[PDB]
Structure formats: structure tokens, C-alpha cells
Amino acid sequence: VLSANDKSNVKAVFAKIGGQAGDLGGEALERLFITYPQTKTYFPHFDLSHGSAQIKGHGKKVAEALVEAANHIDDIAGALSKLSDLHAQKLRVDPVNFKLLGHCFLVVVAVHFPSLLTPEVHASLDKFVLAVGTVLTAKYR
């Protein structure tokens, strides 16, 4: 479930972010690894030095997926369909980790755009990130 105002708030967030999305994706990953060190176990061979090409590269990919989810906000499940296979079937990612990355993305938005993230926009973006995590954990069987 996402209301019409929720969809409007998510669109406002990502329009504001614009081309910065990739770099924000990189910061969210960095914050994830540092604050929740158990998440590194999914990336055992990553160069984890601040601003590594791997973190920046993968961060771009994560953010682009979020941009696609936002642009296809009425059909998130269809937009991230193939990515649900990778995370659920292949990588077997513990569902609690998606909550952690979503929170880190909110932190990154808060750091860069404090006036954007009003209480109501916070709520919408929370619902959006949790919907993304739900889609990516949809099919485990």
C-alpha cells in the first residue's frame, strides 16, 4: 500500500535528488557496513576503503534500482522482478538486512536534505523503502 500523497512525496524526493542518486547510494552502503558490520559478510571480497571503486560502483547500481522503483511506483514488483530472484533465491539475504539498508538511505537523505525530509515525507519514504525490501524478499520458496 502507498497512498496518492505518499507517491507524490517519493516523486518529490527523487526529483530533488536527481543526478546525485549514485553518490547517495555509495554513502548508504558505506554507512551500512560501518554501523552494521555483520552486513560485510555478504560482500566478503569488497575493497571497503572509503570511496572505493567497488562501493561507488555498487552504490550506483543500488540507487538506480531505487530510481526505477520510484519511476514505476505503481508497479514496483514488476520493475525489480529479476532482482528479487538474485536476493531471495540466489543470495539468500536475511530479510532484516533490507530494513537496515533502507534506514541508512533515510539517514543519507537526512544528512544532505534536512528541509526535504519533513515528518510526512519521512513516513512516505519509509513506506517506499520497506515496499522495495518486501519485493526483493517476495519469493524464497
Partner: protein, 145 residues
Amino acid sequence: HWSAEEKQLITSIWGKVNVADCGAEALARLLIVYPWTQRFFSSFGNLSSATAISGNPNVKAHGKKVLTSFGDAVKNLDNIKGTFAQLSELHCDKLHVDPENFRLLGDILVIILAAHFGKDFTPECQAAWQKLVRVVAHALARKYH
């Protein structure tokens, strides 16, 4: 447990935190982002909308009390389990608040500090504050176990 650099990252940010302002924003965001929490504070007044919640005098007054308690955790970092013994009874035995809610309020506090401090709220600083909210959350849930 606590390193000296974790103590300095927590202490430095806290020295600049207005307990009243950030406490109000903390509680307002909790009730707005996670609306089921509104059940616990029904006697506060009009919580029918975000603006009503944001400007509700009781919400502002209570948020201030919540963050003052976080200040007590900052002063006694090595003994958080002992500092929150009474409040653990209140929330567990008398209020019946599920422990997951303590974690969501922690997450929200982290988001508020991030909005308030911007680039000074580094990943390392976040790591420190997320550890604190979790230690506090487990201290409040202590009398469930």
C-alpha cells in the same frame, strides 16, 4: 564495549543537542511514521494529523523527557543497564510496549541527529549513536527477560 573514540563521538554531538527541540521532533516523527504508537499516547490530545501531532503541547513536553533520559545514558555509559531499571518496569509491567518499538524510536533519533548535524554526522558518528540507541533499547526491555 565502549572505546574512547565512541565516547568522544557521542559526547561531542550531545553537547550541541537541544533536548527540548530534538525530543519534540523525535516523538512527533515516531507517532507520524509508525501510527500504531499513537495508541500509547491517546490521552495527549489531537493526533489526527501530522501538524496536530507536531504542535501538540504534550507531545513536545514528553519528547523533552524522553531525550533527557538519553542524556542520563550519555553521562553513565558504562552502567546503562542500571540507570534504566525503573523505566524498564514502567514500559514492560505497566505500559506493555513491545521492544521493537524501542528500536524504531532509536532509528528515528538517529534520523533526527542526521538532519540536525548534516556532514558532521559521519558514518563513524552514526555507528556510535546506533550502538547507543540499541544498548538503551535492550536496557528498557531488560524486565521482559
